[PDB]
Design an enzyme around this catalytic site. Structure first.
Site, PDB file in Angstrom:
ATOM      1  N   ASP A  93       3.010   5.428   6.199  1.00 20.31           N
ATOM      2  CA  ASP A  93       2.887   4.367   5.168  1.00 20.31           C
ATOM      3  C   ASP A  93       4.135   3.699   4.705  1.00 20.31           C
ATOM      4  O   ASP A  93       4.801   4.292   3.859  1.00 20.31           O
ATOM      5  CB  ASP A  93       2.089   5.080   4.044  1.00 20.31           C
ATOM      6  CG  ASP A  93       1.606   4.148   2.967  1.00 20.31           C
ATOM      7  OD1 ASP A  93       1.570   2.941   3.240  1.00 20.31           O
ATOM      8  OD2 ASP A  93       1.244   4.597   1.891  1.00 20.31           O
ATOM      9  N   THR A  94       4.469   2.497   5.180  1.00 15.07           N
ATOM     10  CA  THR A  94       5.615   1.695   4.793  1.00 15.07           C
ATOM     11  C   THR A  94       5.582   1.273   3.313  1.00 15.07           C
ATOM     12  O   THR A  94       6.667   0.973   2.743  1.00 15.07           O
ATOM     13  CB  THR A  94       5.879   0.330   5.580  1.00 15.07           C
ATOM     14  OG1 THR A  94       4.735  -0.489   5.244  1.00 15.07           O
ATOM     15  CG2 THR A  94       6.110   0.429   7.061  1.00 15.07           C
ATOM     16  N   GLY A  95       4.444   1.241   2.669  1.00 13.18           N
ATOM     17  CA  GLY A  95       4.377   0.839   1.235  1.00 13.18           C
ATOM     18  C   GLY A  95       4.439   2.048   0.299  1.00 13.18           C
ATOM     19  O   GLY A  95       4.075   2.031  -0.903  1.00 13.18           O
TER      20      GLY A  95
HETATM   21  C1  LIG Z   1       6.783   4.385  -7.746  1.00 11.23           C
HETATM   22  O1  LIG Z   1       5.980   3.194  -7.723  1.00 11.23           O
HETATM   23  C2  LIG Z   1       4.902   3.396  -6.828  1.00 11.23           C
HETATM   24  O2  LIG Z   1       4.361   2.474  -6.223  1.00 11.23           O
HETATM   25  C3  LIG Z   1       4.442   4.858  -6.660  1.00 11.23           C
HETATM   26  N1  LIG Z   1       3.426   4.917  -5.669  1.00 11.23           N
HETATM   27  C4  LIG Z   1       3.529   4.766  -4.343  1.00 11.23           C
HETATM   28  O3  LIG Z   1       4.539   4.561  -3.711  1.00 11.23           O
HETATM   29  C5  LIG Z   1       2.155   4.932  -3.663  1.00 11.23           C
HETATM   30  N2  LIG Z   1       1.977   3.863  -2.710  1.00 11.23           N
HETATM   31  C6  LIG Z   1       1.055   2.919  -2.869  1.00 11.23           C
HETATM   32  O4  LIG Z   1       0.316   2.901  -3.874  1.00 11.23           O
HETATM   33  C7  LIG Z   1       0.897   1.858  -1.810  1.00 11.23           C
HETATM   34  C8  LIG Z   1      -0.510   1.837  -1.197  1.00 11.23           C
HETATM   35  C9  LIG Z   1      -0.710   3.127  -0.318  1.00 11.23           C
HETATM   36  O5  LIG Z   1      -0.350   2.785   0.995  1.00 11.23           O
HETATM   37  C10 LIG Z   1      -2.194   3.554  -0.370  1.00 11.23           C
HETATM   38  C11 LIG Z   1      -2.430   4.765   0.515  1.00 11.23           C
HETATM   39  C12 LIG Z   1      -3.845   5.278   0.778  1.00 11.23           C
HETATM   40  C13 LIG Z   1      -4.352   5.088   2.088  1.00 11.23           C
HETATM   41  C14 LIG Z   1      -5.650   5.559   2.378  1.00 11.23           C
HETATM   42  C15 LIG Z   1      -6.412   6.181   1.392  1.00 11.23           C
HETATM   43  C16 LIG Z   1      -5.918   6.382   0.106  1.00 11.23           C
HETATM   44  C17 LIG Z   1      -4.619   5.912  -0.186  1.00 11.23           C
HETATM   45  N3  LIG Z   1      -2.997   2.411   0.026  1.00 11.23           N
HETATM   46  C18 LIG Z   1      -3.970   1.840  -0.731  1.00 11.23           C
HETATM   47  O6  LIG Z   1      -4.239   2.300  -1.832  1.00 11.23           O
HETATM   48  C19 LIG Z   1      -4.605   0.621  -0.094  1.00 11.23           C
HETATM   49  C20 LIG Z   1      -4.423  -0.699  -0.871  1.00 11.23           C
HETATM   50  N4  LIG Z   1      -5.993   0.806   0.132  1.00 11.23           N
HETATM   51  C21 LIG Z   1      -6.612   1.809   0.774  1.00 11.23           C
HETATM   52  O7  LIG Z   1      -5.970   2.718   1.254  1.00 11.23           O
HETATM   53  C22 LIG Z   1      -8.130   1.615   0.802  1.00 11.23           C
HETATM   54  C23 LIG Z   1      -8.904   2.426  -0.213  1.00 11.23           C
HETATM   55  N5  LIG Z   1      -8.671   1.644   2.134  1.00 11.23           N
HETATM   56  C24 LIG Z   1       1.965   6.334  -3.089  1.00 11.23           C
HETATM   57  C25 LIG Z   1       1.260   7.300  -4.033  1.00 11.23           C
HETATM   58  C26 LIG Z   1       1.206   6.306  -1.750  1.00 11.23           C
HETATM   59  C27 LIG Z   1       5.613   5.803  -6.452  1.00 11.23           C
HETATM   60  C28 LIG Z   1       5.725   6.462  -5.072  1.00 11.23           C
HETATM   61  C29 LIG Z   1       6.955   5.187  -6.857  1.00 11.23           C
END
Ligand SMILES: COC(=O)[C@@H](NC(=O)[C@@H](NC(=O)CC[C@H](O)[C@H](Cc1ccccc1)NC(=O)[C@H](C)NC(=O)[C@H](C)N)C(C)C)C(C)C
Lengths: 99, 99
Positions: B25-27
């Site tokens: 996951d790049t995001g």
């Molecule tokens: C800090 O600010 C942030 O953004 C904080 N969060 C992040 O960095 C978070 N990233 C993120 O929040 C970026 C998005 C992730 O890639 C998730 C991963 C996922 C895939 C499949 C099923 C369930 C979840 N994608 C999604 O939620 C995408 C839109 N949708 C899906 O996966 C749908 C349900 N098919 C992580 C928790 C993954 C943190 C790490 C700093």
């Protein structure tokens, strides 16, 4: 272009006349962007993320220019922290992962 | 290897003796994996996703083999739908985005 992941992958997009930055996300099945002033008929829908489910508004056949690359898809608008470029669009500008 | 996004990017990992599949996951700024039996001292921490914030347990300096590639980092375990390979690890097996 070539992109290393030292820094979040951000990009400049153009959607219904407004210039925004979006995040290229390989772990996102879908394209979900913040609340923007978008016109057309939409539909209620739900998506999930680590923390749960937000109801989004589902707009289809929207024109979006990604890094100066034109694509057409379904885009969902909702209460998202960051705009995301999901796989339904990355396939279109023919984005690959490499290692 | 070369990876097109027609299908979610999944991979085989080896962490503290157990063989799992994770999502590249790049995001994702961070590596977060489901509840696994991991030994060592940990710390409470919070992270955010589209839908909110889950408290995770923060383990650092964990050995993980990604697609047969050895890396070492901080991994957080929590109530996540899918295991994720974040940027703190993808930089290490020298993963790039291309378009
Ligand atoms: C800090 O600010 C942030 O953004 C904080 N969060 C992040 O960095 C978070 N990233 C993120 O929040 C970026 C998005 C992730 O890639 C998730 C991963 C996922 C895939 C499949 C099923 C369930 C979840 N994608 C999604 O939620 C995408 C839109 N949708 C899906 O996966 C749908 C349900 N098919 C992580 C928790 C993954 C943190 C790490 C700093």
């Amino acid at each position: 272009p070539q992109i290393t992941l030292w820094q979040r992958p951000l990009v400049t997009i153009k959607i219904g006349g407004q210039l925004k930055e979006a995040l290229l996300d390989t772990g996102a099945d879908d394209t979900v962007l913040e609340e923007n002033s978008l016109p057309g008929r939409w539909k209620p829908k739900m998506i999930g993320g680590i923390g749960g489910f937000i109801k989004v508004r589902q707009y289809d056949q929207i024109l979006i220019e990604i890094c100066g690359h034109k694509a057409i898809g379904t885009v969902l608008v909702g209460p998202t922290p960051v705009n995301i470029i999901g796989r339904n669009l990355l396939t279109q500008i023919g984005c690959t992962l490499n290692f």
